[PDB]
Symmetry: C3
Subunit: 209 residues, 3 copies
């Protein structure tokens, strides 16, 4: 396999370097814009430079190990023009990937995650630790599912959606592009574009855009 | 082992055909009453006919792969007279079954489920994806536990109880026959027969019968 | 390895004797102060006597298999003077222990638990069934994390903290010594010493001391 460059040397890049190692990948290093992180390491893996150095590593696969959906879209659209770069798909050895699971490139499926049957993910998705996607779930591009999220059958998550940790989504709910479900929310109604919903039962807090 | 007939070719029958395959079972097909599903398939497994065709497959094990507790009881009582048919017990290879676990026939224990010690399940139970039943939990017949439910020590769930996804039940709580706990509920008090409770903390919504 | 003495022959001692067996340990027996439990067994393992008999088993490792943080501290401080006894560290074979995980003695990591990277636990901690501790989480001494708890990145749990089942803690939250988070709580703010918080969103209920 190609060596891997991890974009983002924060909390998620920390866990994704761990994921990559468990997947048998060689991680060349991180790219990160943080001044203070230049010349630093996570567990023997160096921060190589800033994101505009990505063109020096076209031989590598990339992954954008940043939780914020909009951050991953912003980075892909600025630094990663269509067809110039390749992206890894990282699936933890302890994740369960069932039948007729379709996952597009750049996606991270973390330890203990379960995708049962007929689940479709777009590009640069995250399914974090111990989250569950039941039958017929569809994710767009740049979706973040946090640890322990409970995504019931036939839920649709649009592009740049974020589902917070240990939230629960009723079967057949649709969540439109750019929405955010707060950690622990219990969602029993469809969510409209860019809405932030929180609580039990989930209620509209604000729009994020 | 006997070949398997799955009653119900919906979302749960989809996941239970997956479970059966992972358990090394040969699935003969589904029975389903849906007109539009006659002559259809899930992943090479045909819908063979309607439920009244069950008498043509007495050579097979059956499982009732329908989430609603009352649906499974209704189907067993109409179509499956005592002692005429055999039922499979399906335990995902990634489920954890500990010590002194007693599971009666027709039960489905799904991927990532954990039953620790001294857990007793009656007939035709479901313990769905990544749910946990702690020490001394007792389930009656036709109990449905949804994905990620958190059933603490010494909880008692009566017959035809349903616990919604990622709900949490305090230790030593009793839930009487036919009750329903909504998804995400946090249950800290005993629940009476046929009560529907929802929320954090769970409150009585209505009676289901 | 040394044989093991389990202090506490209740629900948690039941599950920890199971854990010990799965870890390939020989359990000599339980110590328990309950009159009615003298001469009793859990799955072939006897209650040997009361806690003041611990000095007859200095050849053994001990574990304090009692959920209440304050109970474990009380027992260690009364019966287990510094340097007289050794404590087991029990990690279920199905727990995931990642990289740069530091766990001090007496700790129990239960089935399906996940500790990702840079997690630090003090002495006599519990991480129960299917709980998740994300990057940079720090636990003090005598912390109890209940089943399915969702402890996000960089959370700090002080000494004698208890996090209830399937609760969710926002990243970078600090919980000071002796606090309690109720089952199912959704914690988005720092918690002060000995505070009990419950609900979604978590609110102060009372002080425990
Ligand atoms: C948006 C953006 C970010 N970065 C860098 C800055 C930081 O070093 C890094 C982001 O690190 P961070 O720790 O602030 O955030 P993340 O690594 O995304 O972590 C977040 O999501 C995870 C899923 C959670 N587990 C964490 O608790 C949460 O803080 O990415 C860039 O280099 N360029 C960018 O354009
Ligand atoms: C009650 C009843 C049902 N059926 C058939 C009709 C349908 O094709 C099938 C039921 O399919 P369905 O998708 O409507 O429902 P289920 O397959 O039970 O799925 C439900 O529970 C699961 C645990 C959840 N994961 C799903 O999100 C939820 O929709 O069973 C029969 O053939 N006869 C019956 O008597
Ligand atoms: C405080 C104290 C207790 N004990 C004994 C008495 C009991 O037999 C035993 C405690 O048993 P118990 O069942 O009351 O409690 P625990 O074994 O701690 O169980 C509790 O925490 C677990 C994590 C949960 N899964 C259970 O649902 C919850 O009840 O310890 C002693 O022998 N000495 C002590 O000083
Ligand atoms: Na799990
Ligand atoms: Na949960």
């Amino acid at each position: 396999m190609k060596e891997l460059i991890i974009v983002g040397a924060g909390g998620h890049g920390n866990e994704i370097s761990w994921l990559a190692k468990r997947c048998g990948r060689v991680v060349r290093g991180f790219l990160d814009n943080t001044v203070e992180k230049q010349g630093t390491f996570i567990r023997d893996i160096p921060v190589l430079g800033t994101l505009d150095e990505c063109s020096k590593f076209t031989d590598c696969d990339f992954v954008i190990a940043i939780g914020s959906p909009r951050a991953r879209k912003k980075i892909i659209e600025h630094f990663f023009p269509e067809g110039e770069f390749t992206f890894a798909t990282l699936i933890d050895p302890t994740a369960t990937i069932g039948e007729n699971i379709h996952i597009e490139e750049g996606t991270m499926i973390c330890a203990g995650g379960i995708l049962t049957v007929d689940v479709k993910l777009g590009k640069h998705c995250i399914v974090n630790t111990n989250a569950v996607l039941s039958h017929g779930v569809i994710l767009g591009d740049y979706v973040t599912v946090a640890p322990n999220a409970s995504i019931s059958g036939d839920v649709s998550l649009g592009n740049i959606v974020e589902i917070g940790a240990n939230a629960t989504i009723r079967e057949k709910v649709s969540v439109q592009d750019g929405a955010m479900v707060g950690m622990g929310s219990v969602v029993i109604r469809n969510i409209l574009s860019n809405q932030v919903v929180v609580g039990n039962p989930a209620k509209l807090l604000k729009v994020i855009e």
